Design an enzyme around this catalytic site. Sequence first.
Site, mmCIF file in Angstrom:
data_model
loop_
_atom_site.group_PDB
_atom_site.id
_atom_site.type_symbol
_atom_site.label_atom_id
_atom_site.label_comp_id
_atom_site.label_asym_id
_atom_site.label_seq_id
_atom_site.Cartn_x
_atom_site.Cartn_y
_atom_site.Cartn_z
ATOM 1 C CD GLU A 176 134.699 11.637 131.139
ATOM 2 O OE1 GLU A 176 133.962 11.023 130.339
ATOM 3 O OE2 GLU A 176 134.300 12.031 132.259
ATOM 4 N N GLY B 116 144.488 39.045 118.444
ATOM 5 C CA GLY B 116 144.739 40.158 119.354
ATOM 6 C C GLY B 116 146.174 40.143 119.845
ATOM 7 C CB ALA C 142 150.280 43.551 122.982
ATOM 8 C CD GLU D 135 142.960 47.485 125.806
ATOM 9 O OE1 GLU D 135 142.331 48.566 125.842
ATOM 10 O OE2 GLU D 135 142.951 46.731 124.806
ATOM 11 C CD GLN E 94 138.000 45.602 124.172
ATOM 12 O OE1 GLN E 94 138.581 46.540 124.722
ATOM 13 N NE2 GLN E 94 137.310 45.750 123.047
HETATM 14 N N1 LIG Z 1 133.273 37.443 120.383
HETATM 15 C C1 LIG Z 1 133.985 38.495 120.806
HETATM 16 N N2 LIG Z 1 135.084 38.819 120.122
HETATM 17 C C2 LIG Z 1 135.828 39.851 120.499
HETATM 18 C C3 LIG Z 1 135.441 40.629 121.651
HETATM 19 N N3 LIG Z 1 136.342 41.586 121.794
HETATM 20 C C4 LIG Z 1 137.245 41.430 120.816
HETATM 21 N N4 LIG Z 1 136.922 40.404 120.053
HETATM 22 C C5 LIG Z 1 137.655 39.899 118.902
HETATM 23 O O1 LIG Z 1 138.993 39.686 119.322
HETATM 24 C C6 LIG Z 1 139.888 40.129 118.319
HETATM 25 C C7 LIG Z 1 140.699 41.293 118.851
HETATM 26 O O2 LIG Z 1 141.412 40.911 120.005
HETATM 27 P P1 LIG Z 1 141.206 41.633 121.389
HETATM 28 O O3 LIG Z 1 140.910 40.613 122.417
HETATM 29 O O4 LIG Z 1 140.319 42.784 121.209
HETATM 30 O O5 LIG Z 1 142.695 42.120 121.615
HETATM 31 P P2 LIG Z 1 143.500 42.099 122.969
HETATM 32 O O6 LIG Z 1 143.647 40.703 123.415
HETATM 33 O O7 LIG Z 1 142.946 43.055 123.931
HETATM 34 O O8 LIG Z 1 144.945 42.560 122.512
HETATM 35 P P3 LIG Z 1 145.480 44.044 122.288
HETATM 36 O O9 LIG Z 1 144.302 44.920 122.345
HETATM 37 O O10 LIG Z 1 146.035 43.873 120.970
HETATM 38 O O11 LIG Z 1 146.473 44.236 123.362
HETATM 39 C C8 LIG Z 1 139.030 40.510 117.140
HETATM 40 O O12 LIG Z 1 138.943 39.379 116.286
HETATM 41 C C9 LIG Z 1 137.705 40.858 117.753
HETATM 42 O O13 LIG Z 1 136.570 40.694 116.922
HETATM 43 C C10 LIG Z 1 134.222 40.211 122.343
HETATM 44 O O14 LIG Z 1 133.832 40.819 123.329
HETATM 45 N N5 LIG Z 1 133.573 39.164 121.873
HETATM 46 MG MG LIG Z 2 143.243 44.766 124.670
#
Ligand SMILES: Nc1nc2c(ncn2[C@@H]2O[C@H](COP(=O)(O)OP(=O)(O)OP(=O)(O)O)[C@@H](O)[C@H]2O)c(=O)[nH]1
Ligand SMILES: [Mg+2]
Lengths: 424, 426, 426
Positions: free
Chosen positions: A241, A130, A86, A58, A11
Amino acid sequence: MRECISIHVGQAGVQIGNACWELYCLEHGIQPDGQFNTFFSETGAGKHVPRAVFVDLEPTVIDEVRTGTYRQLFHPEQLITGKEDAANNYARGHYTIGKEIIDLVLDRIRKLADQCTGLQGFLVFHSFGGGTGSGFTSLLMERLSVDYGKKSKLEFSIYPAPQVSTAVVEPYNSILTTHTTLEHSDCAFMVDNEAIYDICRRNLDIERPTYTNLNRLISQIVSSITASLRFDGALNVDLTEFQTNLVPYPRIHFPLATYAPVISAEKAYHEQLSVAEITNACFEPANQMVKCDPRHGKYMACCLLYRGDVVPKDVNAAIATIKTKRTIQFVDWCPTGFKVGINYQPPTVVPGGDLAKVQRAVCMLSNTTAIAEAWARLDHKFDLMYAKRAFVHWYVGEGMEEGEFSEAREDMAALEKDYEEVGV
Amino acid sequence: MREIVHIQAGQCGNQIGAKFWEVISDEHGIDPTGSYHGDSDLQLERINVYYNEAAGNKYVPRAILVDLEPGTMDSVRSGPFGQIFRPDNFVFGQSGAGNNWAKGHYTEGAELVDSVLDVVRKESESCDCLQGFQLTHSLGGGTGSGMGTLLISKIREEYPDRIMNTFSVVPSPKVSDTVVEPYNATLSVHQLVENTDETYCIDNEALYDICFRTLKLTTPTYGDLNHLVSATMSGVTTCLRFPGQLNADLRKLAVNMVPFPRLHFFMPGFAPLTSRGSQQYRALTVPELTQQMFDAKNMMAACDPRHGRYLTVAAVFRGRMSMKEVDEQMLNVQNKNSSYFVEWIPNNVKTAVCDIPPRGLKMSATFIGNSTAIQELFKRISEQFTAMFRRKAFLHWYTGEGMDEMEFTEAESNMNDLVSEYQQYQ
Amino acid sequence: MREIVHIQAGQCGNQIGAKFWEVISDEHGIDPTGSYHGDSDLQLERINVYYNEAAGNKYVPRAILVDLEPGTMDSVRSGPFGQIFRPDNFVFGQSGAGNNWAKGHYTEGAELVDSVLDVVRKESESCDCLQGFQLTHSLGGGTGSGMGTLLISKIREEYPDRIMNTFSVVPSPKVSDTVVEPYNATLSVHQLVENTDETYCIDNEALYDICFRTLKLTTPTYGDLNHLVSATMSGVTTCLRFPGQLNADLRKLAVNMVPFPRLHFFMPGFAPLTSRGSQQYRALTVPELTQQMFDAKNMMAACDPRHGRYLTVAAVFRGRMSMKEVDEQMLNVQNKNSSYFVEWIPNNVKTAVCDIPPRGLKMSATFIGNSTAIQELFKRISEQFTAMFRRKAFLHWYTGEGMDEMEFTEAESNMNDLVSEYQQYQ
Ligand SMILES: Nc1nc2c(ncn2[C@@H]2O[C@H](COP(=O)(O)OP(=O)(O)OP(=O)(O)O)[C@@H](O)[C@H]2O)c(=O)[nH]1
Ligand SMILES: [Mg+2]
Ligand SMILES: CC[C@H](/C=C(/C)[C@@H]1C[C@@H](OC)C[C@H](O)C(C)(C)[C@@]2(O)O[C@@H](C[C@@H](OC)[C@H](O)C(=O)O1)C[C@@H](OC)[C@H]2O)CO
Ligand SMILES: CC[C@H](/C=C(/C)[C@@H]1C[C@@H](OC)C[C@H](O)C(C)(C)[C@@]2(O)O[C@@H](C[C@@H](OC)[C@H](O)C(=O)O1)C[C@@H](OC)[C@H]2O)CO
Ligand SMILES: Nc1nc2c(ncn2[C@@H]2O[C@H](COP(=O)(O)OP(=O)(O)O)[C@@H](O)[C@H]2O)c(=O)[nH]1
Ligand SMILES: Nc1nc2c(ncn2[C@@H]2O[C@H](COP(=O)(O)OP(=O)(O)O)[C@@H](O)[C@H]2O)c(=O)[nH]1
């Protein structure tokens, strides 16, 4: 010509990618409907199409992208989807659900590579912590390593903060990712949300932020990193680099990424915004984009990417001044601890944004023993959690084994030891 | 992708379910005749999570309505949104359950359960990617408790890799609503410990407290209590149905909220809940909302959360808000009052955010707490049960349906083990 | 010079044929009333390859339409281009074929075949230099399979030094369309092995895959599938009808594609095939087209080409392109993936190019592959057939028309020999 392929996973990664693409469009005058080669693959109707891989298990974030403003820009394949996420589970990414989609992703990547006459490599956007961004990304990276080998594999990673979080299985996942991207990724650039918030509070004078702002900030950094591929300038840096200059030993490859000047419209006029000042700001403890004090650590190697109006003499002077300071500690074995990149093209302002127009901006990528502390903290957290075998049934219930965790911990310990050695 | 099948069982289960379907319908812009009259494309994008589409742009909830007696479901059909349900999805028997778990689980319910299973299978076959099942019932009666548990057992056996979550109305320490409640509750809980992935524990006394102390409501109806429950229910699945900054999911919540498989009994809460008199007096800030969320007076179980520790809490925020602010608030709560959070799980609070707020509010939040305080409920139930069983009081009603003493002892043993486990982390 | 006579037999054969005649008509600028409304002289120069000219600048396809039942051909006549055909070229019987090869080949079809032969002779007499015959039919039914095969036998006996090529729709491994399909297919294939010069093997499952996976088409019609087939068909004869840099021919293709006389079963493909959504996203380069062509997902048979080796492949390109580029691409494919090409035939890929591209495209290509993977289809058919025949299941329908067991055994033997031959080069 010089060409690179972006990969955006999760996400968070996808969100970041949106911002990045917007920024790119603003830079190169491309309209939201596609009306450069480095990032945009050009077709036979005056239409420019991004050269990216967009992956999520998702189908929500991707769906949003598909409906939103830049839907006509992206291909109906580059944006890939799944069925169920996941759910903060490395095991459901790396073992169970990832091996359904991964093949398709690989195919897409291959196709993209085929369309290039000099692929510099990859830029990957994920998140330590995540579910998808941990396991799936790791899996992808391994496959890439198996395939291409000597193509650059740069990562942009959202490191979990010490005093704040948004998921109570985040230590495990991150640890697993670290274990399984230690022998694949060449560089893993780091950003931390708490740090960004602090920066916003301090420099911007804004204390009601949101994820969008953070994403935009990240995108700026990304643009700075990639500006040398797309514009002219003295000292044109390459993606290849960075690996050479920021990785003294193959396990040690996590450098922090910071940007200056991150400042609002009100005190842009008050400040001079000279080169030296910006350089100084870059090395200041509070201005850093992670939760670590670089006073508690020696700088191995630093890379500076000046963008806009810069007399190289001034830059040199600034560097000399930095060297003079007692604190700013460097390692014994790296005297020449600076890489300098310059571009004539200035930064680009995004409408309805946080940042004002500037003459000159700087992006600093620094590999230091300050991150060791963070690693140790993470390890401690993991130990605290895993001692009671908390949440382990979820991970073990989809593929993993008791023993893998131990191995990971051992690896982390080894890494820590290496860092300690480097410190001496 | 991500279809959810709803099952509502017994009197309370069907009643709460009716309200839930009303609420969800209004959220999605669906009128009682199954027609869409919304203003946003977001309303239809993920409508498939709860609804099935039919000829003439008709939407039919994926809901299965179950009872051993026809009265309650006749009332439901007569009701406002009653005509929205598929007629073939009403599955009923003829003889009542007499507040008797054995009748629900072993005898009367056993005769009906196959028919229910067939309907369930039919619904699951229409799912592109079925996420799991949501059940609504009471624990103290015969149908929701005995029949409901039975259904859960069957479905978990057939779909063991799907999510099974229940909203379970439990007995209240002061004022019991039936005499055999302890027996029924213990018998149900025994089965739920082993056959469900998560259970939201609702206490009617807590709801009354909310209505009187918080909402300032002189004369709450069961309808009004049901509304509150429905609001909480909707909160849980918001991130399946709408976009966001942190898109949650049932499975994700389970992953973050269940550190050991048997400890899956949650205390739900909802915010804001403010009296109609004092609406302009409150400033609707995320901090204040957080404070409401964590206030024991705003919980829906029969616990004092301050008499235990939180193993994990999941907060789901709805509306526009600063992630910075949210995170900071979460940090502040934990730093300030670290004694109320188990020390072996750093970052005990998980946050999710969905952009689209519920009707009539700019911001709202739903709270889900896994607290060791829940042990008090179990302990109290166990005490009550033993008080009866040691004299074999009321037992002939159950032995007459083929149950043996040994089952009751097993149930007691399970209960005690659960309590012991909770005490470990306390 | 180079006249081609078309025969379309049975339901599928007539249906595909209708679409083919539509497509060819549009290519040549011929409207349904046989009037020319083209913009280029190239359109008429070789119109004689498919059409015969009549009084008042009327053009009439050299097509013979054959069925044992009148329905399908009545529909064809009712159709858009139906009035373009010569009424005297509809040859039909009255009794159906009951998906029965014996009825098509030995009994009902035997009564009609002489009449068809007379029409065929009449058409061939109008040819300055007849190249050969094109047949369209299914292999699994009674008319196209039995009657069609019979016709082929007759014509080869009378015109043994002309080209005999068929577009043959075969059964699909997952979802059979008739119960006796294996019997009919085996009986047809036996005859085609010995009496045809080339056969293009079309699998409806592959077409559906193309429609869903590639074209992103939610709701393909048989019409749409037919269109694709027609496009492939047109590709094959493009070099007879238009100028080019490498002018191909049917005979030339046969020479380059058939290294041993019995191995003449080809997997056809067409490119580009792109979703209407993602049209601007694709860059239409010869390399990319080549990649599409060689992609298993873009094939129209029930094979995994990666489970065998290519004996030879013929590619026919349409539009403006660099011969340098084409050749280089061909070299790259073979060098990179030499394992998928038989090593005893250097330069396994033959290329032809025709300057005039099909409507609405700047570039297109048609792919014709002789792969040892085709053995899988035959093997699967043989297995099915034996499963039935060993129990003499459904056999009375065939013995009742005078067929003997020995014929079936002969057919099986032929099939197995073919499979063995294919395995040799695998
Ligand atoms: N900077 C930033 N951090 C994000 C964002 N979305 C989620 N995060 C961070 O990413 C982490 C959560 O992982 P996500 O990327 O939401 O999870 P995912 O990869 O979708 O994995 P699942 O949802 O577990 O399948 C947390 O530490 C959040 O604060 C965003 O748009 N910007
Ligand atoms: Mg996700
Ligand atoms: C040469 C004859 C030939 C054999 C092979 C293996 C050929 C070669 C290459 O195409 C020319 C593959 C090609 O370069 C790609 C990698 C771009 C790609 O198209 O490969 C396929 C899978 C591949 O099989 C694995 C394919 O089905 C196929 O047929 O591949 C997925 C696809 O997703 C977009 C994409 O990733 C059979 O006729
Ligand atoms: C020369 C004197 C002559 C003898 C013969 C055999 C002649 C020669 C040819 O005509 C000149 C035949 C001719 O070339 C055709 C084949 C086109 C065709 O017309 O033949 C007939 C059948 C044929 O007899 C078999 C015919 O009845 C006939 O008389 O044929 C079917 C017819 O269906 C459309 C068509 O297929 C008697 O006067
Ligand atoms: N919150 C709520 N509780 C109810 C409702 N109806 C019954 N109850 C409660 O449910 C329990 C009685 O069980 P009930 O569902 O009526 O029995 P059943 O039909 O045998 O399952 C008691 O604790 C009641 O207070 C309702 O509509 N809302
Ligand atoms: N592609 C395609 N296949 C068809 C069509 N009509 C029938 N079929 C297929 O042809 C086979 C049935 O044979 P059919 O031609 O209808 O029987 P016949 O009249 O006895 O030859 C089946 O495999 C059908 O799926 C069509 O228009 N297009």
